[model samples]
Target chain A: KGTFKDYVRDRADLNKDKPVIPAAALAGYTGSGPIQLWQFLLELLTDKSCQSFISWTGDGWEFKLSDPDEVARRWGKRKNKPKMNYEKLSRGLRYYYDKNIIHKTAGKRYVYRFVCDLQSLLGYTPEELHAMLDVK
Target chain B: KGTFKDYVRDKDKPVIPAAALAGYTGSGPIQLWQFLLELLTDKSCQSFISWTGDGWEFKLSDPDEVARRWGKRKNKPKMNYEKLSRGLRYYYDKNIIHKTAGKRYVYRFVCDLQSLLGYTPEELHAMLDVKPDAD
Candidate 1:
């Protein structure tokens, strides 16, 4: 994936009420544990936008084409099956695109934005904030 | 829907896992809210044993068949369409389902209460408990 603009321009069925889910925002997962990539992907895609999308890779980290092997290595060390080859990673990403769970950024190598409206439903709103404070 | 046995028997795909839509569990409309009736029927058919599905509904008091429509009545005093609904007003039981921001259940109707391993997600693990917050 490349950029938000590219995804916005290309994705046809964007839900008016749904919020966006970006990969960078996937931080709730185990920071150093074995990555259940697909499970994390689904959760990230379905979550409410505000709660799901991240503005930055909290620790100043980013992913790239070169990172697939690294991700695969991480998965391997973490006991993931089918192994993490670049081809397999790309294949998985392709499947996600087919499912409308994500779309590639225009110029980016591996970045993606979610297409499902899970974000809005899963996220908290300003009113929820007010309710939090109103709690007696 | 009805019970634990019901949700498992559901022939769905991808198993959106208990962690779906962020563990925070804000909420939104159920894609098939209309199917609740059939689910209730299923429970009655099974004599209330096995297969209670997870979902939410706009329950009305006293078993009036037509009363279901009261949920959409025009003269509702509190229908803000903002973040509230009548369903939350009269029910005496604490909501098993939560009302997310706009209005809808956040997690599955019942959650992982009847996991194949026989432990509810809450009892097995502690996390965001997305129970109903409004009256």
Candidate 2:
């Protein structure tokens, strides 16, 4: 069997024909169609402007929200939920736990991990992802 | 003395951690943070839910009772584990709470409590009679 990277690249190639929107903020997301909450969050992290408020932490899977209220507000705007707050937003994520989509990195505040195989979705290494996002 | 809300509202009181007040106590209905804090603080509630080791993680020893309590608090007589769990799912994006994988009924808090409760993890563990992590 090839490496995980090779496997992920093969999977990601299936959708390579589509335009890759590297930044979520610039994506001009208009509540277009149905999407998963975790996918939306990953896009947000990919956007440089969002780094100030939220970004990847120790690894690609782990992330932290420095300003959760701001993130929630942005999500609310995207979803057209004027009254969206962190409480409501978080409740949505808690549902993912049972699905094995994401989990909390215990003992650390504001830290969560994506239990899903992100590599197959993003098809990039941490270094390549950092470069794509222009993150130092 | 004023209520906790009033105390939290007073901007002059720098004693509170600004981060804690950011959304822990808001105008909306009882937030998960508020509910968790309420449960964690009450020793009687331990049977319903309580913090786990290191003070950051928690477990629902009695999810049914917890849901019932939430139902009573929210006046949702039909509130059950399924509905209550649905509410908890909303907190995922908000980074308020997270579920510990592979562990049933286990969860952890992701928000900082220092600014809100004026206590560090050490202080919280100490007060809760939990052993501190070895350096």
Candidate 3:
């Protein structure tokens, strides 16, 4: 069993200062190309954790894995999806890795993060975002 | 009482024809802006019943008075839409018009049928037909 101290910090390789583009924008841009290349970096900064212990991807915020069990516990409680557990969460992460959406940040056991440059790969440009909002 | 024969022979305006910029090139462009402009040109393109069809804008079509009623028949045993009638149907052809797209058309009432020049509307070009990053 892990202690509270071991799970208090972000064990992942994420740069906590970084931000993420919103999910709605991501959906619209998915058909395009890499987000980072298009200059629409993830403006959504900050991460969320369940039970104040484990951090994981929330509705829009990205997080680092300080505690995998916390991630699993929160994941299940939010959806009330009883089938979820640490093993299931781990398997899901593995599937995501296989799909190339994320990778382990070398030597970081609990550190897995999305490296996909959303904006550039998806061709989501500032001009497009501006145009969509009629920012001109 | 209007007979089925009378309805079939009735008219309002010609049915609206969905027009395309490229005809049969890469893809096609048929949208709201084009439909409205067509209504302005042809008198036959006048609203048979006014805003009685689908779309974000008006349901402007090139159908004639009789044609409109006939179209109603296809949808129901009786043409029940309040604005539609045999007289209204015949009124469309009383003016100049022509269909552009298949089952869609533009009226040439007073507006010139000739393509407008020197300008392009937003999302009007063929490029608009493409989804920027569809690969």
Candidate 4:
């Protein structure tokens, strides 16, 4: 068996850090690309105002969509998926099950947790991590 | 032979601009798949990204440029091809997308194009009007 550090080290790599660009820099940009479901979920998890609807279960990375429909509504608005609903929205979570991005807490309602490293990768995006991880 | 109008039947939804429809189905250019589809369908974007003329297949002739645009759209300045690719790999199991073997940055949508984009590949191919990806 391997330790948590080993598994994390395997998935993470490091590249030199670069300053983040401001949104105004891309003002004229078009083509609003995909913001994934998990990422969107993470987005709300951090926004204090959204807590009443979605928040961590206070047990590690576990989270629950208390108001799943509202969460789905937010997701729909974010993606402009007017037809989105909890049923269709949650289906995407199943896809993340094996990828280790997330896991459905057994017998739990709208309850799930993250398997992917939360802050480490987010701290420097995967490719940035991979850059330093390329070698010793 | 039938045009997109027949496929979409959007007579009532005020013209949302063909470019807006680039999401191809009232979806804004929010999803990566939609963004790429928009790029593929646009004549100007053919240089960096284009369809392979085989169903929903396509290629990223300039992944760097494509990656930059996608990151900006996501407001994630840190996003790169690697991050973008990891996301794409997720699409595989869902059968939402598939990467062609022995191909660099070449992939295809595995889902139903007609249902997802409100048009069939045949319609898309026909719409291209004999245009092919320019080298």
**Per-residue C-alpha lDDT of model 2 across residues B59-116, encoded as one tens digit per residue:** 8889999888877876789988898788678776688788988888887878765554
**How well does candidate 1 score on lDDT at residue B85?**
34
Candidate 3 has a TM-score of: 0.27
Clashes of each: 23, 17, 61, 12
Candidate 4: chain B TM-score equals 0.71
What docking grade does candidate 2 earn?
Answer: incorrect
| Strongest candidate by TM-score | 4
lDDT of 4 by residue, A1-136 (tens): 2332233344345432322311221121212245677667766665555667877676656778889899888788878788998889768888899788899999997899888865443443434322332311
Per-residue CA lDDT of model 1 for A17-123, tens digit only, reads 33132222333222323334554443332233423232212111121232446554544444546555656667777887788765766777556555555324334
Residue-wise C-alpha lDDT for candidate 3, range B1-135, written one tens digit per residue:
332223223333322222422221212554223334433223443444222222111233334453444444344444332433333333345432332234332222222222221122222222122112111
Q: In order, what is each prediction's RMSD in angstroms?
A: 21.0, 21.9, 22.5, 21.6
Candidate 1 chain A — worst ten consecutive residues by lDDT sum?
A54-63
Deviation of model 4 at B83, angstroms: 1.0
Candidate 3 lDDT at B103 equals 35
Give the lDDT of residue A134 in candidate 2: 64
**Candidate 2 chain B weakest ten by summed lDDT:** B11-20
- In candidate 1, stretches whose alpha carbon ends up further than 4 angstroms from where it belongs are A1-36, A41-66, A124-136, B1-135
Ranking by TM-score: 4, 2, 3, 1
Best-performing candidate as measured by lDDT:
2
* Interface C-alpha root-mean-square deviation of candidate 3: 33.1
lDDT of 1 at B34: 19
Off by over 4 Å in 4: A1-136, B1-29, B129-135
DockQ score for model 1, please? 0.01
